[PDB]
Amino acid sequence: TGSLYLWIDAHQARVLIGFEEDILIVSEGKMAPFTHDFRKAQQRWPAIPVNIHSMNFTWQAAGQAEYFYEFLSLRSLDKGIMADPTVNVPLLGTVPHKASVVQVGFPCLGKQDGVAAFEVDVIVMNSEGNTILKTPQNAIFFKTCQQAECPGGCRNGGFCNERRICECPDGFHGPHCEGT
Amino acid sequence: TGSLYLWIDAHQARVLIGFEEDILIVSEGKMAPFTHDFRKAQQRWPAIPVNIHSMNFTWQAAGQAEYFYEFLSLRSLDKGIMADPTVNVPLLGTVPHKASVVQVGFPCLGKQDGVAAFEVDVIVMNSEGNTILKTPQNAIFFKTCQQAECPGGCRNGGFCNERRICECPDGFHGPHCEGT
Numbered sequence: 001t002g003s004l005y006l007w008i009d010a011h012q013a014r015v016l017i018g019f020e021e022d023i024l025i026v027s028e029g030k031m032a033p034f035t036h037d038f039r040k041a042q043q044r045w046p047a048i049p050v051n052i053h054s055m056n057f058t059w060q061a062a063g064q065a066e067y068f069y070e071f072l073s074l075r076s077l078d079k080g081i082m083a084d085p086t087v088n089v090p091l092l093g094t095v096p097h098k099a100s101v102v103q104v105g106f107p108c109l110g111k112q113d114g115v116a117a118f119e120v121d122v123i124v125m126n127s128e129g130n131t132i133l134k135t136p137q138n139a140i141f142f143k144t145c146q147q148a149e150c151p152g153g154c155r156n157g158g159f160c161n162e163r164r165i166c167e168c169p170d171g172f173h174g175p176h177c178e179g180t
Numbered sequence: 181t182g183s184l185y186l187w188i189d190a191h192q193a194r195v196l197i198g199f200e201e202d203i204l205i206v207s208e209g210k211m212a213p214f215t216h217d218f219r220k221a222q223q224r225w226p227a228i229p230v231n232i233h234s235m236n237f238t239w240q241a242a243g244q245a246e247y248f249y250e251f252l253s254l255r256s257l258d259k260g261i262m263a264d265p266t267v268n269v270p271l272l273g274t275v276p277h278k279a280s281v282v283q284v285g286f287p288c289l290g291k292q293d294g295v296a297a298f299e300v301d302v303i304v305m306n307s308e309g310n311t312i313l314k315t316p317q318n319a320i321f322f323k324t325c326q327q328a329e330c331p332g333g334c335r336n337g338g339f340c341n342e343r344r345i346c347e348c349p350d351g352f353h354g355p356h357c358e359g360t
């Protein structure tokens with residue numbers, strides 16, 4: 001009956017876990033079997049690696065019925081390791097009829113090495129306002145962060161970010177914050 | 181007898197104090213009269229303004245004799261306000277025969293509003309190794325710093341620098357740290 005789909009594309013799944021196959025999360029508005037026993041499923045998930053700064057999810061409401069998504073919580077539980085996870089979409093919106101990519105960003109601050117715990121609480125509502133899908137209650141996700149080490153180091157009180165670029169202050173630019 | 185000159189060019193003097201005249205500091209290897217009573221002179225100097233991120237000094241050893249300069253201390257006494265002052269020259273070098281510009285940088289961190297105290301201790305030595313000129317002993321300089329306020333603010337745990345640019349982390353770019 002249902003028309004809702006949520007999945008990780010074959011390409012994104014390959015960079016993440018090594019297998020170039022679509023990972024189905026929701027098919028025809030029903031959670032995939034692996035997500036039924038969430039705690040068993042989660043214990044097979046390693047922390048997101050340092051080389052992964054963001055993850056692409058694909059979703060669609062493939063029918064004539066309208067669906068509404070809402071990001072209730074985008075929260076880092078280790079703010080000194082990683083800032084709040086981000087989404088490249090409005091927090092409340094319609095699930096698109098055309099399959100579209102939602103990028104979840106994992107902003108490691110670059111000040112500390114470590115594993116940051118975080119939440120991505122999202123609900124899907126039908127046109128009656130009822131919640132029909134949602135992140136499993138109390139779900140925790142993990143991201144591995146590394147301390148930034150820029151080539152040569154950032155001068156003029158500049159800090160190195162996790163993309164190996166110098167974060168330069170007042171009238172200071174260049175690869176190591178030298179120019180004016 | 182002396183050949184050493186140090187001064188602030190007319191243009192730099194205009195943006196700094198409002199008067200488009202060269203400010204002579206050292207002429208023919210002799211400190212300018214105003215620098216004799218350093219404490220009286222210093223009390224007429226306001227903290228460097230927020231709109232000034234760096235200052236240009238011009239120097240030359242206009243004769244055949246060689247002179248050597250050495251920056252002994254480039255230190256901020258308020259590290260949380262401003263990082264250590266910088267120079268765009270090697271710390272030990274020869275004073276050029278051709279008049280050349282030395283840029284002293286004042287790197288306000290953008291985290292705090294306030295006045296930062298700092299030191300610029302430099303000596304000039306002749307070819308016998310004797311110090312013939314130097315910053316007056318225990319000299320303190322001041323720079324006004326402002327807390328950075330980027331238009332819209334820096335997302336993804338990014339910080340705003342004092343040149344109103346977003347300092348973006350891991351796989352995050354753009355005007356407010358949004359893109360990947």
Ligand SMILES: CCCCCCCCCCCCCCCC(=O)OC[C@H](COP(=O)([O-])OCC[N+](C)(C)C)OC(=O)CCCCCCCCCCCCCCC
Pocket residue numbers: 004005006016017023024025026034035044045046047048055057059102104120122123124133134135136141142
């Ligand atoms: C748009 C983003 C939404 C969704 C936002 C919530 C999650 C976003 C958080 C980002 C962090 C998640 C990454 C987890 C870390 C990781 O390494 O993932 C491991 C697995 C690798 O996949 P795997 O080892 O194969 O697991 C599946 C195996 N099968 C079943 C295919 C045989 O990858 C996975 O197993 C997939 C993990 C996704 C499971 C989360 C389920 C929550 C879904 C909420 C559904 C309700 C609302 C949406 C409905 C349209």
Ligand SMILES: CCCCCCCCCCCCCCCC(=O)OC[C@H](COP(=O)([O-])OCC[N+](C)(C)C)OC(=O)CCCCCCCCCCCCCCC
Pocket residue numbers: 184185186196197203204205206214215224225226227228235237239282284300302303304313314315316321322
């Ligand atoms: C290359 C950088 C070196 C030099 C590095 C040391 C200093 C660098 C520190 C940066 C901060 C200094 C800025 C001071 C803040 C300020 O607002 O400056 C105010 C004055 C404005 O100028 P003014 O009000 O006219 O003062 C002179 C008035 N007259 C005499 C012309 C009538 O501007 C001035 O009065 C000029 C201030 C410079 C006085 C410092 C004297 C120390 C000189 C050391 C000499 C020894 C070694 C070099 C010899 C070649």
Ligand SMILES: *[C@@H]1O[C@H](CO)[C@@H](O)[C@H](O)[C@H]1NC(C)=O
Pocket residue numbers: 011012015056101103
């Ligand atoms: C994620 O999706 C964006 C959107 O086009 C794409 O540019 C990027 O290459 C994708 N990344 C992966 C690992 O598939």
Ligand SMILES: *[C@@H]1O[C@H](CO)[C@@H](O)[C@H](O)[C@H]1NC(C)=O
Pocket residue numbers: 191192195236281283
């Ligand atoms: C300082 O000197 C540099 C070197 O060319 C010049 O580009 C800059 O415009 C000068 N600034 C002032 C205020 O004179």
Ligand SMILES: [Ca+2]
Pocket residue numbers: 148149150152153154159160
């Ligand atoms: Ca660094």
Ligand SMILES: [Ca+2]
Pocket residue numbers: 328329330332333334339340
């Ligand atoms: Ca800001």
